[PDB]
């Protein structure tokens, strides 16, 4: 259900990224847990920088972040989203 | 002593856009003068309550907050500490940490802002190392 990227539809993953970007949690601990989860799921070498320290040119809206993840995984031999 | 009430004191220092960049270097970054102006004389039940107030004031400050991205702005608006760059993170410590320059163990002041610094996890661990 939330063990890997392949367990998430793209819409479900967008929900997760949106919650993080809006800091929509009841505590700092809850937000850190979600960001760590995101890092483990994406396997992207930038880690939390995708959310907080975007590369010049990158779209750091929740939708932008999802597309950066989707494109990186597609280009680097990784499995993609469920449906 | 971190859990006994105190009023915040001290002046802080002028800062610029590189304020949080300084948190990864030397003794860390100072508390900004503008923040000290807002928090001086307020009573806090604990140091954690003070920490929350620091980040809330950062969220509201037009010069300090402009140098955070939208997701980090959301974080500070909740009173959370913002996330540091990846290479300054250490394990589950991923956000800026408040540090006492003269240690509390040695009679350092808990709520005097001139005794407080903003650090990254990596720099905070290194300062305490010895
Ligand atoms: Zn310290």
Present the secondary structure layout.
The complex is a heterodimer of chains A (83) and B (130).
Chain A: H1 10-21, H2 28-42, H3 49-52, H4 62-75
Helix pairs in contact in A: 1-4
Chain B: E1 6-7, E2 29-30, H1 33-39, E3 43-44, H2 47-60, H3 70-77, E4 97-100, E5 116-119, H4 121-128
Antiparallel strand pairs in B: 1-3, 2-5, 4-5
Helix pairs in contact in B: 2-3
The complex binds zinc ion.
Shape of chain A, please? globular
CATH architecture of chain A: Orthogonal Bundle
Largest interface: A-B, 20 and 18 residues
Total of helices of chain B: 4
Secondary-structure-based class of chain A equals mainly alpha
Biggest sheet character of chain B:
3 strands, antiparallel
Q: Would you report the number of β strands of chain A? A: 0
Strand numbers in spatial order across the main sheet of chain B = 2-5-4
Q: What is the helix fraction of residues of chain B, given as a range?
A: 25-40%
Radius of gyration of chain A (Å): 12 Å
Estimate the global geometry of chain B from the Cα principal axes.
globular
What does the radius of gyration of chain B come to?
14 Å
CATH homologous superfamily heading of chain A: Colicin E immunity protein
For this structure, the CATH topology of chain A is Non-ribosomal Peptide Synthetase Peptidyl Carrier Protein, Chain A
Class of chain A, according to the CATH hierarchy? Mainly Alpha
The assembly state of the depicted protein chains is heterodimer
PDB class: antibiotic/antibiotic inhibitor
Keywords: protein-protein complex, 4-helix bundle, dnase domain, HNH-motif, antibiotic-antibiotic inhibitor COMPLEX
Assembly: dimeric
Entry title: Crystal Structure of the E9 DNase Domain with a Mutant Immunity Protein IM9 (D51A)
């Amino acid at each position: 259900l939330k063990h890997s990227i392949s367990d998430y539809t793209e819409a479900e993953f967008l929900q997760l990224v949106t919650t993080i970007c809006n800091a929509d949690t009841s505590s700092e601990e809850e937000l850190v847990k979600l960001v760590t989860h995101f890092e483990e799921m994406t396997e992207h070498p930038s880690g939390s920088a995708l959310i907080y320290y975007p590369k010049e040119g990158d779209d750091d809206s929740p939708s932008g972040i999802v597309n950066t993840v989707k494109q990186w995984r597609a280009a680097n031999g990784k499995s993609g989203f469920k449906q | 002593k971190r859990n006994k009430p105190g009023k915040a004191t001290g002046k802080g220092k002028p800062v610029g856009d590189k304020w949080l960049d300084d948190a990864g270097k030397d003794s860390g970054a100072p508390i900004p003068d503008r923040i000290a102006d807002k928090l001086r004389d307020k009573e806090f039940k604990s140091f954690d309550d003070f920490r929350k107030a620091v980040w809330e004031e950062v969220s509201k400050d037009p010069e300090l907050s402009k140098n955070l991205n939208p997701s980090n702005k959301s974080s500070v608006s909740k009173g959370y500490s913002p996330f540091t760059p990846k290479n300054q993170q250490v394990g589950g410590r991923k956000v800026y940490e408040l540090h006492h320059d003269k240690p509390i163990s040695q009679g350092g002041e808990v709520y005097d802002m001139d005794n407080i610094r903003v650090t990254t996890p990596k720099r905070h661990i290194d300062i305490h190392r010895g």
